[PDB]
Amino acid sequence: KETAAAKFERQHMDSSTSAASSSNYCNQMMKSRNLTKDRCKPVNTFVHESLADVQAVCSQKNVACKNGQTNCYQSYSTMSITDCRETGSSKYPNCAYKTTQANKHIIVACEGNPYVPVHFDASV
Numbered sequence: 001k002e003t004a005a006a007k008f009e010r011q012h013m014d015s016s017t018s019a020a021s022s023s024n025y026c027n028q029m030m031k032s033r034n035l036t037k038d039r040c041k042p043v044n045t046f047v048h049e050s051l052a053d054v055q056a057v058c059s060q061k062n063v064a065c066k067n068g069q070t071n072c073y074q075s076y077s078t079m080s081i082t083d084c085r086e087t088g089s090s091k092y093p094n095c096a097y098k099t100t101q102a103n104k105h106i107i108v109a110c111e112g113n114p115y116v117p118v119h120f121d122a123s124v
């Protein structure tokens with residue numbers, strides 16, 4: 001079984017680019033991060049910052065999670081992110097995503113020792 005921290009990295013980290021450079025980014029990344037294997041994951045955000053910078057959010061601003069838990073943290077800085085969401089043309093096995101690039105604060109849920117991101121809650 002994948003660890004929670006490892007799953008977060010696979011689903012949400014893309015430090016290799018500064019930003020999505022085209023409309024096909026999400027189609028490509030959703031496939032390669034294995035988020036379309038058996039069904040199309042409907043919504044997924046990638047963060048275009050270093051792993052260290054995202055990990056550091058777990059010692060930034062403590063805020064409530066949407067679900068009412070208290071282990072969420074909001075980045076002090078905006079970060080480059082890409083939101084990927086399925087479009088109406090999407091039909092497994094031919095998933096199709098809209099790519100939306102933005103610079104926004106991220107909110108992550110943190111757990112463990114080391115205390116690291118395990119869920120992507122939202123951007124603001």
Ligand SMILES: [Cl-]
Nearest residue numbers: 043044045120
């Ligand atoms: Cl997400």
